[PDB]
């Protein structure tokens, strides 16, 4: 705008929380669909839904990770990453069924003398590969669901040989997007790139995507967030540079059906 407005400068406000950014590269709405509540024509459980609105549809900041020259990549699953986040998590565990959309805001600032590019991908149904060459589809629920902490990618597939006490976890090789497909094609998924010379952040607005109108949030993750270094971090001449990546996510238009007593999962 001649009166100053820009694609790089944004303000997002949800509930009692506001995010500002002065170096954005626009924002992505996945598949062109903004989050919406479940319509009567597509409805399936007949009971009155719980809709927490501002108590849950607000910005939750997960633990900050660290990007270095050794970093192969990071991944998170939704709703899992948010399972312990305030009243969203509480509503999630008290109901059999729940659906939700999300605003994902990835934060990474550095300096005009740093280099590197992070690919931020939102994958519908991000099924990852496990660590075993003797048995298949065998990753434990505990290992499959890291919560807020997330998981990381590896540059090398290294098979769990302990047949007596199997690790039962994922072994996500980075150039294969941890699922057997090549990373260069992951751009067909909703994404943005944090290229440090261009932008401090990535913002992805995600619709609820599923083959059902509503489902078990505790048994099933709808979206996976994968962040991988497309171009490695570099700075001036320092052999070991580091810059933080902070992840802030807001549930959007979430509703819950099937109220009963709280689910207490075996997470270890």
């Amino acid at each position: 705008e001649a009166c100053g407005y820009s694609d790089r400068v944004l303000q997002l406000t949800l509930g009692n929380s506001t995010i500002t950014t002065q170096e954005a590269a626009n924002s992505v709405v996945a598949y062109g669909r903004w989050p919406e509540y479940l319509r009567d024509s597509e409805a399936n459980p007949v009971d009155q839904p719980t809709e927490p609105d501002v108590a849950a549809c607000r910005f939750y900041t997960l633990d900050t990770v660290s990007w270095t020259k050794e970093s192969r990549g990071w991944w998170w699953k939704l709703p899992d990453a948010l399972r312990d986040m305030g009243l969203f998590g509480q509503n999630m565990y008290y109901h059999y069924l729940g659906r939700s959309g999300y605003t994902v805001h990835v934060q990474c600032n550095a300096s005009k003398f740093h280099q590197g590019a992070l690919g931020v991908f939102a994958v519908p149904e991000m099924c990852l590969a496990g660590d075993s060459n003797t048995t298949t589809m065998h990753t434990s629920y505990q290992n499959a669901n890291p919560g807020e902490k997330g998981g990381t990618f590896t540059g090398t597939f290294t098979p769990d040989n302990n047949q007596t006490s199997p690790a039962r976890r994922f072994c996500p090789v980075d150039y294969l997007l941890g699922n057997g497909t090549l990373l260069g094609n992951a751009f067909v998924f909703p994404h943005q790139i944090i290229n440090l010379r261009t932008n401090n952040c990535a913002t992805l607005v995600l619709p609820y995507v599923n083959s059902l109108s509503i489902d078990s949030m505790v048994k099933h993750n709808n979206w996976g967030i994968a962040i991988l270094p497309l171009a490695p971090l570099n700075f001036a001449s320092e052999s070991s540079p580091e810059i933080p990546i902070t992840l802030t996510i807001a549930p959007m238009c979430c509703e819950f059906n099937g109220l009963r007593n709280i689910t207490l999962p075996r997470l270890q």
């Binding site: 590269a25 099924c127 075993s132 060459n133 629920y141 597939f157 294969l176 057997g180 067909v188 995507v209």
Partner: protein, 283 residues
Amino acid sequence: AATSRDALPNTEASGPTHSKEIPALTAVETGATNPLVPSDTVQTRHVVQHRSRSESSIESFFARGACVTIMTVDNPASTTNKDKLFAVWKITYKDTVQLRRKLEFFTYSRFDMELTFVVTANFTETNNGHALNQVYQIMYVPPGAPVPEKWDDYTWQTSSNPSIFYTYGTAPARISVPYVGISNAYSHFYDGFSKVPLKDQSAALGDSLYGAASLNDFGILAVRVVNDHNPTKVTSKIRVYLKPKHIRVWCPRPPRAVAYYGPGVDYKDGTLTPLSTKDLTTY
């Protein structure tokens, strides 16, 4: 209103440029692909386009019958000590790789299904006896129904299950199935479990396979030779061809780049290096 078989856009003639408009420059960080056509960066002539995307429509891409399984049955002598072999197959597109890979370009799909059955038989022993023409029973057993234990037990009565009686030597059998899913679309990928492990409950009790939803989704096909035992043993195979028709697909995905290892997205050590050596400055 754009039909699949409509012609693509004409190339418009384009002249020289000395402008502040910059089509060639962009920023992929945004998540968008730059929508450029040749006239944006070079001088072009006028071409009247006649090409069409008719054969790459989702229907057209899948409009072909693919082999999803091979079933083996036989009809032995009465005197043999081994049971007469009837076949049981759990229905899926995942036992073979080709159609599976095409469907996995997408996360979700809806379609009606056409199944065509090719049946071949041969003699097993360097014998000289013969058999009369065989009739085959292909019975669909939906999850819940009694699975056959013997080639001739009561289940083969099929009072409620659909069955095809196929006469050997006739045109291959064919049936259609509607969209039978208990979801609004078939999930080609399910990032979840069918059970919640509960704290209070035994570790063994809350356990289930990753990515697996119903332990029996669609049931099985049970196939047998209806003819009684002949002195000469005959072995037969039933090849099943599946064609997705009236198909719709959602959420595109990258194709499988390394060999499949089982029903899930798992990959096996040693199969992970698909790409060949080629140098950066070599044409």
